[PDB]
Amino acid sequence: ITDDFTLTSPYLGFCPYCRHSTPCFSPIKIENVWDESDDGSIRIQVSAQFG
Amino acid sequence: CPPGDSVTVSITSGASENSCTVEKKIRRKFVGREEYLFPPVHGKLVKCHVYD
Amino acid sequence: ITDDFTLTSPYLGFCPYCRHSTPCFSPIKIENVWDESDDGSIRIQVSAQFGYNQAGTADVTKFRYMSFDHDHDIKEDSMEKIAISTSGPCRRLGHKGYFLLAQCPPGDSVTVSITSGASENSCTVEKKIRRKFVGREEYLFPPVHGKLVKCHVYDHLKETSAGYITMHRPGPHAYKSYLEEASGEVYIKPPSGKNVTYECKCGDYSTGIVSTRTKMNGCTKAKQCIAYKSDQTKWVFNSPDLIRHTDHSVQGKLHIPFRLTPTVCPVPLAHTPTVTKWFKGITLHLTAMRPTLLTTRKLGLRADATAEWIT
Amino acid sequence: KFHTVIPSPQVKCCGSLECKASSKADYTCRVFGGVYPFMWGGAQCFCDSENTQLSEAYVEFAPDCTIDHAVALKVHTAALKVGLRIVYGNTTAHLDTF
Amino acid sequence: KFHTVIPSPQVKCCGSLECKASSKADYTCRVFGGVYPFMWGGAQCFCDS
Amino acid sequence: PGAFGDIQASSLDATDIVARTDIRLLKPSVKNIHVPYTQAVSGYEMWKNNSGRPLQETAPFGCKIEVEPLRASNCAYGHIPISIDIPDAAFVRSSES
Amino acid sequence: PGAFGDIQASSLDATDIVARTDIRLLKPSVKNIHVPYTQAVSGYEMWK
Amino acid sequence: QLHYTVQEEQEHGTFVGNIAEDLGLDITKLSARGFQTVPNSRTPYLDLNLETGVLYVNEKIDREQICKQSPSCVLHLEVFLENPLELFQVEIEVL
Ligand SMILES: *[C@@H]1O[C@H](CO)[C@@H](O)[C@H](O)[C@H]1NC(C)=O
Ligand SMILES: *[C@@H]1O[C@H](CO)[C@@H](O)[C@H](O)[C@H]1NC(C)=O
């Protein structure tokens, strides 16, 4: 296990939509959306690194 | 966010713009019986499982 | 045939649903909507020329206006202020002359509107626009893996036609602010140096040309003489809220843009069913997440075909 | 799918009109009387309800029917053709015959 | 409710690449000959088809 | 008026377009000028709603049905007799077999 | 594949995860590198 | 899937990058396999030579206009062929 975050890096994904309705390369590829809360919450995994 | 069919995420700068959508069937959900839209102020307190 | 936009002018329409939900005369009246493409792109025909300056010298950031005035003149404004809407905003992606093209979400009305802050207006009509697909499996947005079927979509190219239009001579358009009646007679007040006709029949029929000279006659009512400006040069499409000229024959013809052409078009593939074997019959255990067509037929003399959309 | 074109209405100031016969696709005309039409600048005539307007309408094809039309046919007496593949004594041949 | 997890595809430039058999949950592994993959910079493999 | 076939033409760019579609005018009431009308539903799109299944999945005996010459290609029924004129040079002697 | 008992395990976090969910791969038709696949619907939520 | 970079303030007829040799196509088969552009992805600043597959520039590429039209400041194009029915993207990034 680790949390030393300076040892990782973001990457480019490949998304089926883009800004203008075509599949193109993008740095904000969404990998997974998990939707099993009880007030409508949503956990998104992207390819970039927030925070 | 409200229910829909896709989940979009986008940066809105102007120095760069991208977006990426997957289709994901989001619909609203309730707890127990008596389907509702906003949690009331007068009600019974039951057990939920929410995210932190 | 022709494409000379230094010779046609925009005109005021009569839109059935203005911004105040009341039918008013508006320079942004839309007249036809076409939605037969497979990509959700529509083609709106407005009564204000797009992509041209005031004389019509084809720059791609200004549009002719046909303003409201006591006088009768045309003007122009920046292209950035035209927004198309059905059920939320949508995306302009072409304009030439009258027509323009946009890809808009499924709603029920079609709105175009200038968004200035000086002479702001809108105009809506009703049109059952909704989302369509190609093939046999239904989809939300086109996939990243599957077959390549051929679907027909609109060009975004300006200089392609699939169309034809009739454009002819303009009609007489009288005003009531060309007149004053401060005494028992009436006086014609033309604009500043124009040739203004009249056809007044109080007593007996009259005509003539008046160039900024207050004329009277033996006439006592304020509404028995009309007077319209005499230009008769520009051309207007036969919209049903104009008066025809006494000739009303074809003078020129213009291009409808945005040809409907064939193109290749990706489609999803579905999960191939597993099949159990029993006596003179298959049982196919099969999944889908969206409505997907299954059809079967025997290979004998009776086909006995079935078809159902399973979900 | 058709396309209703409607040409601009003809108004005769303080007179009378009548329609002829045309030959366009579903021509339909009938006159009126007692109108008093207004434009953006009103009072488009000069006598109180003594005049007529005309009203004509017809149809033609759409500008998308060059892709979206439907060709009606009338078939009879189909005659069959067969492509064969004859091989005799390790020597093949390909034939197409009626 | 399960969670289908796909690791990154191995690509070998003009050499046959068969895969082993492991004991994870529902392992499945097939080869595909004739690829020519593209990243953001094209031609990720130097050996045509 | 109101079924398949209320527009007729020889070709699509022809001029002898004949049609009836129940277009009847109405008397205008409002002071602004326009022309009101009413018309039946386009029978072409009414056919297009509930056309049914095409005959690429209803034809008996199982055959692909092409369009551009209107074939009914490659299905199977009956027996066809033929007779083959074999050249006699492709034979061998019974004193050789 | 397609009903309850789709994936099984003795404990919750143990590595004896016997499973069968009818996963099949597909040959990719786009020049971009990705791995297409189709799969049976989740058995536990169809039971749910 | 391609990626090209056109330079700023380009004139007419300047060669940017060639497509047909990149993806294993022949010159005489381009007219046979129905080589056109996809109508939706066409750009006014780039026409195309349909016989050898080279990609020149039609109008004078102004950066501040299309940077604004597209705040990424890029360009997009798709071409297709019809005898095996394949499609592939071509991206152009003006700098
Ligand atoms: C008005 O008409 C006269 C001829 O009747 C012409 O000489 C004059 O130039 C016209 N005025 C304008 C402003 O066009
Ligand atoms: C073809 O048939 C002839 C006689 O029918 C025989 O002699 C010959 O060996 C055969 N060809 C081959 C390749 O075996």
3-state secondary structure of E3: coil
Give the whole-angstrom CA distance, residue D50 versus residue D11.
11
Q: How many CB pairs under 8 A join A and B?
A: 63
The token pair at H72 is 């990424």
Which residues of chain G lie closer than 8 angstroms to A13, CB-CB?
A: none
CB contact under 8 A, F33 and D37: yes
> Rounded CA gap, C286 and C310, in Å?
10
- Nearest residue in chain C measured CA to CA from B22: C141
* Residue D90 alpha carbon to ligand 2 centre in Å: 7
Distance from the Cα of C260 to chain F's closest Cα (Å) equals 16
Residue with tokens 């488009």: D44
CA distance C1 to C164: 8
CB contact under 8 A, B1 and A30: no
Q: Give me C270's structure tokens.
A: 């579905």
- Looking at CA atoms only, how far is residue G14 from chain H in angstroms? 43
Contact H87, C266 (CB under 8 A): yes
- Ligand closest in space to the Cα of C210: 1
Tokens of H79: 């071409």
> Is the CB of residue C6 below 6 angstroms from any atom belonging to ligand 1?
no
Element (H or E) spanning F47, and its range? helix F43-49
C161 Cβ closer than 6 Å to some ligand 1 atom: no
For chain H, list the strands marked E by DSSP.
2-4, 17-18, 36-37, 54-55, 75-81, 86-92
For ligand 1, is residue C2 a contact (CB within 6 Å)? Answer: no
Q: How far apart are CA F33 and CA D40, in angstroms?
A: 10
- Closest alpha carbon within chain H to A14: H1
Q: How far apart are CA D55 and CA D10, in angstroms?
A: 7
Map D43-93 to HEC letters.
Answer: CCCCCCCCCEECCEEEEEECCCCCCCCCCCCCCCCCCCCEEEEEECCCCEE
Tokens at residue C107, please?
Answer: 């709603």
DSSP one-letter code for C246: S
Q: Whose CA is nearest to atom 10 of ligand 2?
A: D90
Is residue D40 less than 8 Å (CB to CB) from chain C?
Answer: yes
Contact call for residues C163 and D10 (beta carbons, < 8 A): no
- Residue with CA at minimum distance from ligand 1 atom 10: C195
Q: For tokens 């004859």, what's the residue?
A: D86
Residue C70 CA to ligand 1 centre (angstroms)? 21
**DSSP for residue C17:** S
- State how far the Cα of C13 lies from the Cα of D39, in Å rounded to an integer: 10
At least 3 CB pairs under 8 A between chains G and F: no
Question: How far are the Cα atoms of C97, C164, D12 from residue C235, in angstroms, in the given order?
Answer: 13, 15, 22
- Three-class secondary structure of residue C175 per DSSP: strand
Q: Which residues from chain F sit within 8 angstroms of residue D92, using beta carbons?
A: none
- D9 vs F contacts (CB less than 8 Å): 33-35
| Cβ atoms within 10 Å, residue G33 | 18
Q: Of all atoms in ligand 1, which is nearest to the CA of residue C209?
A: 5
The Cα–Cα gap between H77 and H88 comes to 9
Which chain A residues contact residue H89 at CB under 8 A? 22-24
Are the beta carbons of G22 and G3 closer than 8 angstroms?
Answer: no
∠ CA H46-H12-C55, rounded to 5° = 85
In chain F, residues with a C-beta closer than 8 Å to the C-beta of C298 are 60
Distance CA C74, CA C58 (A): 16
Q: Which atom of ligand 1 is nearest to the CA of C193?
A: 13
Q: How far is the CA of F83 from the centre of ligand 2 (A)?
A: 25
Listed in order, strand segments (DSSP E) in D6-45 are 11-12, 28-29
* Residues from chain G contacting residue H88 (CB–CB below 8 Å): 31
Chains contacting B with at least 3 CB pairs below 8 Å?
A: A, C, H
Residue type, D60: E
What is the number of residues in chain C? 311
Tell me if H71 and B18 make a contact (CB, 8 A cut-off): no
8 Å CB contact of B11 and A28: yes
Q: Quick check: F53 contacting C, CB < 8 Å?
A: yes
Residue type, C267: V
Distance D96 CA to ligand 2 centre (A): 26
Resolution in A: 3.3
For ligand 1, is residue C193 a contact (CB within 6 Å)?
Answer: yes
Tell me the torsion sign for CA atoms C92, C95, C100, C103.
negative
CA distance F95 to chain D (A): 17
Q: Which residues pair with H54 in a beta bridge?
A: H18
**Strand H2-4, strand H86-92: pairing:** parallel
- Residues in chain C closer than 8 A to H42 (CB atoms): 155-157
Beta-ladder partners of C114: C82, C121
Indicate whether residue C233 lines ligand 1 (CB < 6 A).
Answer: no
Q: Whose CA is nearest to atom 4 of ligand 2?
A: D89
Nearest ligand to the C-alpha atom of residue C190: 1
Out of F12, F31, F39, the one facing D65 most closely (by C-beta) is: F12
Beta pairing class for C227-228 and C91-103:
unpaired
- CA-to-CA distance for C296 and C310, rounded, in angstroms? 14
| Main-chain dihedrals φ then ψ at residue C188, nearest 5 degrees | -85, 125
Helix or strand (DSSP H, E) at C63: strand C62-64
Pocket of ligand 2 (CB under 6 A): D 89-90
Work out the number of other CB atoms within 10 angstroms of the CB of residue A32. 12
What does DSSP assign to residue H65? H
A16/H contact by beta carbon, under 8 A: no
- The tokens of F7 are what? 């527009």
Helix (H) or strand (E) holding C251: strand C250-254
Provide the CB-side half-sphere exposure for F19 (13 A, CA). Answer: 31
Distance CA(G33)–CA(G38), nearest Å, equals 17
Q: Which of D87, D90, D91, D92 gets mutated to test ligand 2 (max ligand atoms within 8 A of its CB)? A: D90
CA distance G6 to chain E (A): 8
C-alpha dihedral, F47 to F52 to F53 to F54, nearest 10°: -30
Q: Dihedral angle at the C-alpha atoms of C141, C144, C150, C152, nearest 10 degrees? A: 30
Rounded alpha-carbon distances, angstroms, from residue C258 to A4, C111, C128, F85: 56, 20, 21, 60
Cα within 13 Å of Cα(B51), Cβ side: 10
Q: C76-78 and C62-64 as β-strands: parallel, antiparallel, unpaired? A: antiparallel
Among candidates C169, F66, G32, C292, which has minimal Cα distance to D7?
C169
Q: Which of the ligands is closest to the CA of residue C192? A: 1
